[PDB]
Structures are given as structure tokens and as C-alpha cells.
């Protein structure tokens, strides 16, 4: 009974172990590499200061996606506080009240007069830290026994001990620690009054950084409503969303992960979306709301900062990052009209016809790998490379049947073979007798330039001419003369290349259109020999921020030696703004568009897979049934399309350390 509550409470307190360690990972790897502009923590001699180290027992390392997300989380809270400190008259006291503070050293980072990067916080800002008693006991003991922390808040720095380890509160002029189980709304309301937070001459900033997330909506809402009664208050909440419901690919994994750790996300079940948070805050007494998800925060970072962030460590998991970012909200509310959400801080805030000719079915293809590539060489299908979860150079031969897909490994006969890789292309050439391997990467800082041909008959690999520039996440397609068009990728090389198979030559065929001034990463690409046209769909740019919302129609003149590729037409649509999608002509007048991720939001059952008639410029939805959406592991990242009917095979994703998901497999067939 009470054992259940105590256990639940301690499990929730334990989530702080994970977040503090992840923040420490960022302090270790990121902050030393970011200039004074976005360092958070530096002294007058340009030397980094550290605060998270006091609260974390070991060196910490996380995946690049996780680190990037935690830097973004640090930036989220700091940016909101900056907006308040910058606008509030400098004679006013500001009190930052951290609700479920865990071991977060933010107050120390901000109050430290050695930290020249927090100078605007040194004079009139105070802090109140609130968490469960048991957790605060530990935090306070650390504060009182660590000289650097004690000095910041004016305590004795000569003590490496405490008289009483059960003390769960702390009082100093600029920092209070106050125990409260936030599920006890009445105790919290009393606490606000004991701290005199009703004083209208004092600006309050309540922060709930993935803390209220663990509480039932009735309990978290009671806290929000209690703070609304304090004149001149802000409420900043940073927590999870499930914008498309609990069965969206990433959402499903996220909810299960938190449940398995006995710290379920309870409030998000009521507040699924950005709009639901606006309505929530309005109802609870905060009329003025500025809210967006984490990708909007990323887009808002200035260029210099973006440039540095990309250079901190190798990264190439943008689909995962899109998904993560759309699952976290940053909501900043106020209860007073005088506070302006200014330009630099402000967040900006369709029913397709259902296709009647084609439908989506399950069709198991447990190749269970991602970011390889595949092509058809006669009646046969060959998939090469990718990761599962480590990179391979293996070739699978696929035999496709209406109901399932058979697979066998192809033993190779040559002494030399291409290194294991992902994000390469693999394209049929040589009248269906060979397969061309272009580029790819090992780790993200290990883009490759070595190209190969695999001969099906002899099962021998041979290395051919290398690219002058490494290139991965490019797209490729076969042309009607048997040559191969190569588009974009992460590369310093030309935006578009043509590989002439017989001549063994690469040619820069970058079209004379301003669209091609920047390399396009993970775009859909296909060419139709019948209508003699091809399409480029979506694609990101090397800023890892911008994604094209264009479908570009182009044509190929084999007899033009200098300018064989020309743009015919550009179509623009929000559902074209995808990174890591694939496209395939179902018919000369019907292009299938599958998957990928978007910077503008999450795809759902109705728009993950759509179809475009490029001539008449019509669009339809190819809906994913409730059944397959809910009951099967879908994840349209790093997948491939094959047609002997189009099979959607391979793919998957690591969901921000909430577990991994493998795309099971789909098939698009004609409706009889
Ligand atoms: N009912 C409750 N009362 C007090 N604290 C709570 C609480 N429910 C959750 N929390 C606190 O919320 C914290 C979540 S971990 C996040 C810690 C901190 N806000 C940070 O971002 O670094 C935990 O320390 C947990 O104990």
C-alpha cells in the first residue's frame, strides 16, 4: 500500500540519475568545443567551468543523438530564462523555482561569479529547489560538503562533512532547497506562501523540466493552477508529447520504455499535443502562452551556433533526431500581459483523397537491417550492406513471393572486398549482370570514396575508379542508356554526377538551376524510361536543419555532353518535405512516396505513404490500416523499395535510448 507509493516515488526519483548523467556527458564533450557564445560555463580566462561533475560519479558517454538532444534541452531552459532576465527591469527580484529539480546544478552555474557566461544572473536572481525529501537530503549534503558549491551560496567552505545527513531543507540568501512531494497539492500551496512568492514586486519563474511528466494529469495540473495565483509568474514546462497518439512508431517505444522503468509518462496521455498544452495552460490560469517542440528550438539556434554544434562530434541519425524533437515540448506561459514574447523567442504555431487503385498490406521481409541498398538484376533481387546494428558488407539474395520474402547469403569469391558500410547506393548495371556500389560510410566521420562492382555470375567484387570526394546518403538511379545518375549526399563534391559505365568516367552534370547550389541529402530519386522524366523528392541540406519541400521533375538527354540534365518543373507541398524517403513510379503517371521524417511534424497513418501524379499534380493518401499501425513495428527510416507491386523492406531506428525498433515490412498492391 504505502510500500507501493514509496517504490513508485523512488523509481521516479531515479529518473534524475539518468538525466544528470546525460547532462554531464554534454558538459564533458560539447561544452569544451563551443565558443563563448554558447558555452553556458566559462571563466574570465576562457577556461571551462564544470558543475555537473559534482553530482555524477563517473565519466559519462551517450550516443550523438542523445548528446545533441541534451544540449538542446540545456539550451531550451537557458533561452527561456534569458528572455525573462533580458526583459524584466533590472531592479526587480526574479526567483526561479525548480519543480522536481533533481540534482540539477543550474542555480550554482548561474550564481557563480566566476562564470562570466552567467553575469546577468549574478545580482537579482534567486533560486528555490523543490523535490522529494529523500532526494534533497542527498543534494544538500553534496552542496554543504563541496567547497566550490558552498562558496557560491555563501556557506562555509571548510567543511567536508555535515552534522546531520537527514536535513532536507537549506536556506541561504540566494538559494533555498525545500522538500515537497508535488502530489500533495495542499503542501505545495503552503510552501508557495512560506516562501512569500505572492509578492507582486517579485517575478517568479516556475520550471518543470521532465518532472511533472511523471505525475497524473490531475496532480500536475493542480501544481500549475496553484502557481497561477502568484502575481507576475512564468511557467516553463519541458516534457513529452505523443502528437499522433500512443501507437506512432517512436511514441509506442517511448511509452513502453518509461513503463518498463516503473516511471510511466502519465500527463502526456491527457496532453498529447502542442495545442493541448496551450488549452491546458489557459484553463489553469495562464492566458499567455508561447509553445513549440524541440525542432523549432533547433531551427531557432543562430547559424554560428549551428555550425559549431555540427562540428562537436560525428552525427548521422537525423531521422531519429527529427522523431525525438517532435516528442518534446517547450511551453512557456505567463499570467501577466506585460511580458512580451519577442521575435527571437517566439514560436510559430489537409485531407487527401484516399487512393482507390492501390493498398498497403503486410509482407514479412525480416532482412532486419537498415541503410543498405538493393536492386533487381533480372528475376533476382540483391541487397548489400547496411547495419544490424553494426555495419556489414554482406549481400543477401531475395526471392519474393506474394506472401513472404525468402533470403540467402551470397558467398563471395574474391580476395578483396569492400569494407562494411551503410548509406551507399547499389545499382544494377551491365545489362542486368552486375551491381555498382558507390560511396557510403563507416562511422559518420568516415565517408568513403571507394567504389566497386559486384559480378553476379562469378560472385566476385572488383574495385573501380574512386570518387574524388567522399560521399554518403546520396541517391542513385539507373538511366535508360545503362548509366547511373548520382545525386547529392554528404559530400564536398558536385551536386549531381553521371557515372558512364562503359567509359568508366564520372561527369559533373549539376543542372544550371539554383536549387543545386547545395548538396541534397537523402532525397527520393527515380527515373521513368516510359515518360522519359525523373523526379527528385524532398531531401535535407548539409546544415542538418533545412529540408526541401519540392518535387523536382527533370529530363535526361543522353546526347547532350555538357548539360544532359535539365529541370522541367518544380512542385511544392508540405508532404514533400521529407528526409530519408524513397520514391518509385508505380505507373508513368503515379509516383509512390514512402516514409522519411520531416522537420515540420510527424507523419501518421494517412500521410506516411502517398502518391503523386506529376502531370496532373494530384495527390492521394495510401492509408496504413489501424491494425498494422498499432500492432506491428513500423519505422520508415533506412528502408528500401523493391519491385519485381512494390515491397517496402528493411529499416529501423534507435528511439533516443528508449529502445530500438525494426521495420517489419510492407507491400503495396493493386486493388482488384
Ligand atoms: N511528486 C513529485 N514531487 C517532487 N519531485 C518530483 C515529483 N515527481 C517527480 N519529481 C522529480 O522530478 C525529477 C525528474 S528527473 C529531472 C531532474 C531535473 N528537473 C533536470 O531536468 O535535470 C526527479 O528528481 C523527481 O524526483
From Swiss-Prot:
Its EC number is 2.1.1.290, 2.3.1.231. Pfam families: Kelch_4, LCM. SMART domains: Kelch. The keyword Phosphoprotein does not apply. Pathway: tRNA modification; wybutosine-tRNA(Phe) biosynthesis. It is found in: Cytoplasm; Mitochondrion. Its main location: cytoplasm. InterPro entries: Gal_Oxase/kelch_b-propeller, Kelch-typ_b-propeller, Kelch_1, Ppm1/Ppm2/Tcmp, SAM-dependent_MTases_sf. This is tRNA wybutosine-synthesizing protein 4. The lineage of its organism: Eukaryota, Fungi, Dikarya, Ascomycota, Saccharomycotina.
Amino acid at each position: 500500500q504505502e510500500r507501493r507509493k514509496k517504490y513508485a516515488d523512488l523509481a521516479i526519483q531515479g529518473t534524475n540519475n539518468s538525466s544528470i548523467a546525460s547532462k554531464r556527458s554534454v558538459e564533458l564533450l560539447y561544452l569544451p568545443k563551443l565558443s563563448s557564445a554558447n558555452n553556458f560555463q566559462m571563466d574570465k580566462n576562457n577556461k571551462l567551468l564544470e558543475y555537473f561533475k559534482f553530482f555524477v560519479p563517473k565519466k559519462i558517454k551517450r550516443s550523438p543523438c542523445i548528446n545533441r538532444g541534451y544540449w538542446l534541452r540545456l539550451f531550451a531552459i537557458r533561452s527561456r530564462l534569458n528572455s525573462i532576465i533580458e526583459q524584466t527591469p533590472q531592479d526587480k527580484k526574479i526567483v526561479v523555482v525548480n519543480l522536481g529539480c533533481g540534482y540539477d546544478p543550474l542555480p550554482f552555474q548561474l550564481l557563480d561569479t566566476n562564470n562570466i557566461q552567467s553575469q546577468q544572473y549574478h545580482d537579482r536572481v534567486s533560486f528555490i529547489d523543490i523535490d522529494y525529501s529523500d532526494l534533497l537530503k542527498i543534494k544538500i549534503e553534496l552542496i554543504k560538503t563541496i567547497p566550490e558549491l558552498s562558496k557560491i551560496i555563501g556557506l562555509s567552505e571548510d567543511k567536508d562533512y555535515v552534522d546531520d545527513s537527514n536535513v532536507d531543507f537549506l536556506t541561504t540568501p540566494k538559494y533555498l532547497a525545500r522538500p515537497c512531494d508535488l502530489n500533495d497539492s495542499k503542501m505545495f500551496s503552503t510552501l508557495l506562501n512560506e516562501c512569500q512568492l505572492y509578492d507582486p514586486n517579485v517575478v517568479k519563474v516556475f520550471v518543470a523540466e521532465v518532472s511533472l511528466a511523471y505525475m497524473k494529469p490531475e496532480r500536475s495540473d493542480s501544481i500549475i493552477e496553484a502557481t497561477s495565483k502568484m502575481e507576475n509568474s512564468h511557467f516553463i514546462i519541458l516534457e513529452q508529447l505523443i502528437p499522433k497518439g500512443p501507437f506512432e512508431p517512436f511514441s509506442k517505444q517511448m511509452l513502453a520504455h518509461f513503463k518498463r522503468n516503473d516511471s510511466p509518462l502519465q500527463s502526456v496521455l491527457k496532453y498529447n499535443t502542442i495545442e493541448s498544452q496551450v488549452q491546458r495552460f489557459n484553463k489553469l490560469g495562464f492566458a499567455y502562452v508561447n509553445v513549440g517542440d524541440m525542432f523549432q528550438l533547433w531551427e531557432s539556434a543562430d547559424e554560428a551556433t549551428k555550425k559549431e554544434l555540427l562540428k562537436v562530434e560525428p552525427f548521422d541519425e537525423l531521422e531519429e533526431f527529427h522523431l525525438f524533437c517532435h516528442h518534446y515540448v517547450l511551453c512557456h506561459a505567463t499570467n501577466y500581459k506585460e511580458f512580451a514574447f519577442t521575435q527571437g523567442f517566439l514560436f510559430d504555431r489537409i485531407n487527401l483523397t484516399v487512393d482507390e487503385d492501390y493498398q498497403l498490406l503486410e509482407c514479412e521481409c525480416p532482412i532486419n537491417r537498415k541503410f543498405g541498398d538493393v536492386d533487381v538484376a533480372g528475376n533476382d533481387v540483391f541487397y548489400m550492406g547496411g547495419s544490424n546494428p553494426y555495419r556489414v558488407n554482406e549481400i543477401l539474395q531475395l526471392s519474393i513471393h506474394y506472401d513472404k520474402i525468402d533470403m540467402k547469403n551470397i558467398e563471395v569469391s574474391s580476395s578483396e572486398v569492400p569494407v562494411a558500410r551503410m548509406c551507399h547506393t547499389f545499382t544494377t548495371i551491365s545489362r542486368n549482370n552486375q551491381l555498382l556500389l558507390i560511396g557510403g560510410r563507416k562511422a559518420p566521420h568516415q565517408g568513403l570514396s571507394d567504389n566497386w562492382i559486384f559480378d553476379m555470375k562469378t560472385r566476385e567484387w572488383s574495385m573501380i575508379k574512386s570518387l574524388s570526394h567522399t560521399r554518403f546518403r546520396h541517391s542513385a538511379c539507373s538511366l535508360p542508356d545503362g548509366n547511373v545518375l548520382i545525386l547529392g549526399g554528404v559530400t564536398e563534391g558536385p551536386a549531381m554526377l553521371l557515372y558512364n559505365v562503359t567509359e568508366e568516367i564520372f561527369k559533373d552534370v549539376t543542372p544550371k538551376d539554383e536549387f543545386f547550389q547545395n548538396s541534397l541529402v537523402s532525397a527520393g530519386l527515380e527515373f521513368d524510361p516510359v515518360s522519359k522524366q525523373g523526379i527528385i523528392l524532398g531531401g535535407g541540406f548539409m546544415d542538418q536543419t533545412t529540408v526541401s519541400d519540392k518535387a523536382i521533375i527533370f529530363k535526361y538527354d543522353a546526347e547532350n555532353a555538357t548539360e544532359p540534365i535539365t529541370v522541367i518543373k518544380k512542385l511544392q507541398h508540405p508532404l514533400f518535405q521529407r528526409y530519408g524517403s524513397q520514391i518509385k513510379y508505380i505507373t508513368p503517371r503515379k509516383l509512390l512516396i514512402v516514409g522519411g521524417t520531416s522537420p515540420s511534424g510527424l507523419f501518421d497513418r494517412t500521410n506516411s505513404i502517398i502518391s503523386l501524379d506529376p502531370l496532373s499534380e494530384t495527390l492521394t493518401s495510401i492509408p496504413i490500416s489501424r491494425r498494422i499501425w498499432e500492432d506491428h513495428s513500423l519505422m520508415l527510416a533506412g528502408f528500401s523499395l523493391v519491385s519485381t507491386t512494390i515491397h517496402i523492406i528493411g529499416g529501423g531506428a534507435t528511439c533516443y535510448g528508449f529502445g530500438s525498433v525494426t521495420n517489419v515490412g510492407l507491400k503495396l498492391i493493386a486493388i482488384a
